[PDB]
Write a protein that binds this ligand. Structure first.
Ligand SMILES: N#Cc1ccc2nc(Nc3ccc(Oc4ncccc4C(F)(F)F)cc3)[nH]c2c1
Length: 302
């Protein structure tokens, strides 16, 4: 009789926000605290549920730097809902706002943070497997973390360390392709099980995407997803790192380091961060969080 959707005891469900979704993400308000939140909804009728174990992955991640806080997971009408800390625009939104190219200083401030972000995820025995500009969000204007790059949507995540055996998951192939083709590692294209290295290689592709404005396999189309995947993969293998990373030696070093990582191998995150901080220092940049998108006006649902 109210006509109003509530999630849990205190979350009023608001307008849906963002692009895509199709009703899957909505603005929300914690009526008890008078704060806005993000509410991810999943029809209880879903064929491929992801919401609640994404919730479980967040539990396993725990409170962390750059990890959105999770407040609730419960039924909402014919929806299962997960209430999350509200963040700002994604790197993709910001990219468009900056005319689809970030300065090296901005990319390095982003890269240095994400390597740490991924190392954190990996330290919790999880591999991300869904790298893309759309899943990395800055904080909100004021909520103290607007300059922190956050990582969201852990629906495609996986525990790479068996919780009982305490062993790294076994190598294997023939994994079906689903993730986003543009950034995925070459091995992902080959149908191989993803591991730590693959998250790091995807980040590399994304860093070059930001620096160049686009990637050279970006416009490939085909008659079947599998074929497209295969064409993109062929081009990635056919584009020499030194050609892709032309003018960015450190990026080339980062990329072939991760490309050559063994399946079970622990990446040397310190080594990778240093490739970028040394470069950062040598260019004379100051890590002051003044990205290319500053002064600009971002979107807000509130
Ligand atoms: N899982 C998960 C998850 C958890 C928390 C989040 N916080 C946000 N932040 C957010 C910021 C602006 C926005 O709204 C917009 N974003 C981009 C262009 C235009 C608009 C709008 F048109 F609404 F202003 C929608 C959401 N996204 C989030 C996703």
């Amino acid at each position: 009789g109210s006509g109003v959707l509530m999630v849990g005891p205190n979350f009023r469900v608001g307008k849906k926000i963002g692009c895509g979704n199709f009703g899957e993400l909505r603005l929300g308000k914690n009526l008890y605290t008078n704060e806005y939140v993000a509410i991810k909804l999943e029809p209880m009728k879903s064929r491929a549920p992801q919401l609640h174990l994404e919730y479980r992955f967040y539990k396993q991640l725990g409170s962390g730097d750059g990890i959105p806080q999770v407040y609730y997971f419960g039924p909402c009408g014919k929806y299962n809902a997960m209430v999350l800390e509200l963040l700002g625009p994604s790197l993709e939104d910001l990219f468009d706002l900056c005319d689809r190219t970030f300065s090296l200083k901005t990319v390095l401030m982003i890269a240095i943070q994400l390597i740490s972000r991924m190392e954190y995820v990996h330290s919790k025995n999880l591999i991300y497997r869904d790298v893309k500009p759309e899943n990395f969000l800055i904080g909100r204007p004021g909520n103290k973390t607007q300059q922190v790059i956050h990582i969201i949507d852990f629906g495609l995540a996986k525990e790479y360390i068996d919780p009982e055996t305490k062993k790294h998951i076994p190598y294997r192939e023939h994994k079906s392709l689903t993730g986003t083709a543009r950034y995925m590692s070459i091995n992902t294209h080959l149908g191989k099980e993803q591991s730590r290295r693959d998250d790091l290689e995807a980040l590399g592709h994304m860093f070059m995407y930001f620096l160049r404005g686009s990637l050279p396999w970006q416009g490939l189309k085909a008659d079947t997803l599998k074929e497209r995947y295969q064409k993109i993969g062929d081009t990635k293998r056919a584009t020499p790192i030194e050609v892709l990373c032309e003018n960015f030696p450190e990026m080339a070093t980062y990329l072939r380091y991760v490309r050559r990582l063994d399946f079970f191998e622990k990446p040397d995150y310190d080594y990778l961060r240093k490739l970028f901080t040394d470069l950062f220092d040598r260019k004379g940049y100051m890590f002051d969080y003044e990205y290319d998108w500053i002064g600009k006006q971002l979107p807000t649902p509130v």
